[PDB]
Design a protein around this ligand. Structure first.
Ligand code: ZN
Ligand code: ZN
Length: 327
């Protein structure tokens, strides 16, 4: 009834689950490529979610393993490790001092569950690739948020497998609310929604209230959900805010995925996508452009929302930006 030594090494690593920069790749190794399962399990226990929602533990484990298995091991970036990272990063963002006591258990469950399923069954190519190849998925979703609609459908559909319904003891009311929030959050991970989300984040920063001091004031669904949406979007785009040794690993993986799509595009004479082209790519330049135009405006705005909880994260982003720039 005692951990093996590998399990103990895993356990000591997981003591960092509440911190930006967990070594998720080491956890992936220690766990036998189960970073999503062990990290979700640790977080659910940590937040008392099993008791609060009467989730039987074997059901939670069975579902997590099933969820994890529907991420593609042969996809370099959009895989279970990325899902685990986004989960644990959303987990840390949820605990930010400026959001203390703001969100309900159900909203907390929604953000974490949405994080876990948000890229499930990703084929490792983009929406545009899927649309252009006349793929079955693109036709099912009428070319609209193709992957993101698919991630949701898979994530929910998997609750129907044997002993997988982790929401079996929630009331209809809890389930309908949970489901809508999860759907709103995941659909918001589509980059084509990025400009609007950021616009609304800013507007809320311009017009933000604080009550009892410190903590933010969110008094309608629109505001509560848009903050959750931006939170997970932030976790999804958190690679450049992480210590450089992690960030570079993510960048290697995303570039491996992009070039591979570039290869497949040429294996069919398709026009080559924005910097998916091996040979004609500057990884350093693309990262700088990515940070200046997308990641920094997002996180800078987030940092303002929860000032100054996010100062260390923003500083790390800027350091990494200068680092890449120095090339
Ligand atoms: Zn995605
Ligand atoms: Zn993602």
């Amino acid at each position: 009834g005692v951990k093996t030594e590998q399990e103990d090494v895993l356990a000591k690593e997981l003591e960092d689950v509440n911190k930006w920069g967990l070594h998720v790749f080491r956890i992936a190794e220690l766990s036998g490529n189960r970073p999503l399962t062990v990290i979700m399990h640790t977080i659910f226990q940590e937040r008392d979610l099993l008791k609060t929602f009467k989730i039987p533990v074997d059901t939670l484990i069975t579902y997590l393993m099933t969820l994890e298995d529907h991420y593609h091991a042969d996809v370099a970036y959009h895989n279970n490790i990325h899902a685990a990272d986004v989960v644990q990063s959303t987990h840390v963002l949820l605990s930010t001092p400026a959001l203390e006591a703001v969100f309900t258990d159900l909203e907390i469950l929604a953000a974490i569950f949405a994080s876990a399923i948000h890229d499930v069954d990703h084929p490792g190519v983009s929406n545009q690739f899927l649309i252009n190849t006349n793929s079955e998925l693109a036709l099912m979703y009428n070319d609209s948020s193709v992957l993101e609609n698919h991630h949701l459908a898979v994530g929910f559909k998997l609750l129907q497998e044997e002993n997988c319904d982790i929401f079996q003891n929630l009331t209809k009311k809890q389930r309908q609310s949970l489901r809508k929030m999860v759907i709103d959050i995941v659909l918001a991970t589509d980059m084509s929604k990025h400009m609007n989300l950021l616009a609304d984040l800013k507007t809320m920063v311009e017009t933000k209230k604080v009550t009892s001091s410190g903590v933010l004031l969110l008094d309608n669904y629109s505001d509560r959900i848009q903050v959750l949406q931006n939170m997970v979007h932030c976790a999804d785009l958190s690679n450049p805010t992480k210590p450089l040794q992690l960030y570079r690993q993510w960048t290697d993986r995303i570039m491996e995925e992009f070039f591979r799509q570039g290869d497949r595009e040429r294996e069919r004479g398709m026009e080559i996508s924005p910097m998916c082209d091996k040979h004609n790519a500057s990884v350093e330049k693309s990262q700088v452009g990515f940070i200046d135009y997308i990641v920094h405006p997002l996180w800078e705005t987030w940092a303002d929302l929860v000032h100054p909880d996010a100062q260390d994260i923003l500083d790390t982003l800027e350091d990494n930006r200068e680092w890449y720039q120095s090339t």
